Amino acid sequence: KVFGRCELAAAMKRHGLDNYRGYSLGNWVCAAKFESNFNTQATNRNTDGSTDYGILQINSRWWCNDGRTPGSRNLCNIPCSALLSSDITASVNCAKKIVSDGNGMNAWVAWRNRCKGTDVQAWIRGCRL
């Protein structure tokens, strides 16, 4: 599923992400935009052989099991395919564990290079709330 901007904003808010660990909702919608272009089925293979899945591009090296990343961990205790669903619940609950691990939203390279210290409030501007 390809989410609209405000649609995704409302869904992430309803799943408890606005201001989760201090990160306002605009941070999360900006990171989804540049990670996946709001597309739940996005997948991208990394050079070490691991693969990123879903709207927030959660990596199989640490967070999910895809059966083809040797020596990786499954810290969110989920098949990686659950991250591609049109319902964002598994992506959001795994993302909550990742942002709580010490590095905050720097774990997402596109948030770090393209969202961090920008006016992220603009990503939820106009949205019904």
Tab-separated table of C-alpha atoms in Angstrom:
chain	number	residue	atom	x	y	z
A	1	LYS	CA	0.000	0.000	0.000
A	2	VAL	CA	1.189	3.502	-0.891
A	3	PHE	CA	0.067	5.886	1.828
A	4	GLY	CA	-0.897	9.526	1.377
A	5	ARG	CA	1.167	11.951	3.632
A	6	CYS	CA	-1.656	12.942	6.098
A	7	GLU	CA	-3.145	9.422	5.963
A	8	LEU	CA	0.169	7.991	7.156
A	9	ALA	CA	0.512	10.772	9.695
A	10	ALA	CA	-2.887	9.904	11.203
A	11	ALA	CA	-2.077	6.152	11.185
A	12	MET	CA	1.319	6.663	12.929
A	13	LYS	CA	-0.304	8.997	15.502
A	14	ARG	CA	-3.017	6.406	16.226
A	15	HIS	CA	-0.225	3.792	16.723
A	16	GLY	CA	1.516	5.939	19.424
A	17	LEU	CA	4.451	7.375	17.390
A	18	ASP	CA	3.861	11.198	17.763
A	19	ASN	CA	6.485	12.338	20.245
A	20	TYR	CA	7.597	8.668	20.894
A	21	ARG	CA	11.036	9.032	22.591
A	22	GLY	CA	10.903	12.807	22.014
A	23	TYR	CA	10.450	12.563	18.229
A	24	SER	CA	7.597	14.538	16.851
A	25	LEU	CA	5.274	13.057	14.189
A	26	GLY	CA	6.821	15.121	11.384
A	27	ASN	CA	10.129	13.218	12.053
A	28	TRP	CA	8.511	9.860	11.443
A	29	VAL	CA	6.562	10.970	8.317
A	30	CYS	CA	9.704	12.568	6.841
A	31	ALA	CA	11.739	9.355	7.514
A	32	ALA	CA	8.967	7.175	5.855
A	33	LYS	CA	8.965	9.529	2.857
A	34	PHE	CA	12.665	9.286	2.094
A	35	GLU	CA	13.042	5.581	3.191
A	36	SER	CA	10.186	4.149	1.203
A	37	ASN	CA	8.190	6.895	-0.496
A	38	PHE	CA	5.276	5.903	1.742
A	39	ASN	CA	5.178	2.401	0.177
A	40	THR	CA	4.671	-0.468	2.550
A	41	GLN	CA	5.969	-3.049	0.075
A	42	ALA	CA	9.381	-1.335	-0.532
A	43	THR	CA	12.422	-3.637	-0.210
A	44	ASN	CA	16.087	-2.780	-0.768
A	45	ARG	CA	19.077	-5.125	-0.611
A	46	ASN	CA	22.229	-3.956	1.197
A	47	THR	CA	25.829	-4.741	0.153
A	48	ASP	CA	26.446	-7.128	3.103
A	49	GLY	CA	23.496	-9.273	1.907
A	50	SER	CA	20.895	-8.055	4.489
A	51	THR	CA	17.609	-6.469	3.140
A	52	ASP	CA	15.533	-3.470	4.308
A	53	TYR	CA	11.761	-3.875	4.460
A	54	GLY	CA	8.745	-1.706	4.502
A	55	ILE	CA	7.735	1.860	4.967
A	56	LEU	CA	10.556	2.488	7.471
A	57	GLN	CA	13.109	0.152	5.813
A	58	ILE	CA	13.859	-2.022	8.796
A	59	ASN	CA	16.929	-4.116	8.234
A	60	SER	CA	17.092	-7.983	8.449
A	61	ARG	CA	20.716	-7.928	9.901
A	62	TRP	CA	19.261	-7.037	13.339
A	63	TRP	CA	15.528	-6.690	13.508
A	64	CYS	CA	13.654	-9.293	11.499
A	65	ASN	CA	13.973	-12.730	10.075
A	66	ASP	CA	14.013	-13.247	6.312
A	67	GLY	CA	15.736	-16.665	6.215
A	68	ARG	CA	18.655	-15.321	4.086
A	69	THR	CA	20.836	-13.105	6.263
A	70	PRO	CA	23.412	-15.484	7.867
A	71	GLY	CA	24.383	-14.619	11.469
A	72	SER	CA	21.719	-11.952	11.781
A	73	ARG	CA	19.447	-11.315	14.729
A	74	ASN	CA	15.639	-11.083	14.908
A	75	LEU	CA	15.262	-8.459	17.679
A	76	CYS	CA	11.659	-7.526	16.829
A	77	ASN	CA	10.700	-11.297	16.695
A	78	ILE	CA	8.950	-11.028	13.433
A	79	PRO	CA	9.273	-12.379	9.871
A	80	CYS	CA	10.498	-9.453	7.673
A	81	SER	CA	7.456	-10.030	5.369
A	82	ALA	CA	5.176	-8.788	8.216
A	83	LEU	CA	6.872	-5.349	7.690
A	84	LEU	CA	5.464	-5.112	4.147
A	85	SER	CA	1.780	-5.352	5.136
A	86	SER	CA	-0.771	-2.557	4.393
A	87	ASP	CA	-1.380	-2.408	8.145
A	88	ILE	CA	1.590	-0.608	9.696
A	89	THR	CA	1.335	-2.074	13.173
A	90	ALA	CA	4.417	-4.429	12.974
A	91	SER	CA	6.550	-1.712	11.346
A	92	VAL	CA	5.590	0.773	14.065
A	93	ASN	CA	6.099	-1.608	17.010
A	94	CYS	CA	9.528	-2.676	15.621
A	95	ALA	CA	10.456	1.008	14.996
A	96	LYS	CA	9.677	1.756	18.664
A	97	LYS	CA	12.288	-0.851	19.725
A	98	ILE	CA	14.882	0.504	17.255
A	99	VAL	CA	14.506	4.223	18.415
A	100	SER	CA	14.816	3.106	22.052
A	101	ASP	CA	18.205	1.327	21.496
A	102	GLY	CA	20.546	4.235	22.191
A	103	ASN	CA	20.955	5.992	18.812
A	104	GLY	CA	17.493	7.365	18.448
A	105	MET	CA	16.358	8.129	14.891
A	106	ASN	CA	20.010	8.219	13.631
A	107	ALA	CA	19.435	4.474	12.990
A	108	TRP	CA	17.615	5.649	9.817
A	109	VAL	CA	20.264	7.047	7.430
A	110	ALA	CA	17.676	8.992	5.355
A	111	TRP	CA	16.292	10.656	8.526
A	112	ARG	CA	19.868	11.610	9.560
A	113	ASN	CA	20.742	13.039	6.062
A	114	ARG	CA	17.484	14.503	4.967
A	115	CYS	CA	15.184	15.088	7.954
A	116	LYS	CA	17.361	15.795	10.972
A	117	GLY	CA	17.413	19.557	11.829
A	118	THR	CA	15.044	20.513	8.976
A	119	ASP	CA	11.523	21.909	9.518
A	120	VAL	CA	9.912	18.496	9.978
A	121	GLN	CA	6.646	20.130	11.065
A	122	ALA	CA	5.947	20.821	7.389
A	123	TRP	CA	5.363	17.071	6.741
A	124	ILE	CA	2.196	17.120	8.895
A	125	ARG	CA	1.091	20.649	7.849
A	126	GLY	CA	-2.552	20.882	6.841
A	127	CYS	CA	-3.417	17.337	8.013
A	128	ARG	CA	-6.677	16.781	9.777
A	129	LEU	CA	-6.009	16.772	13.265
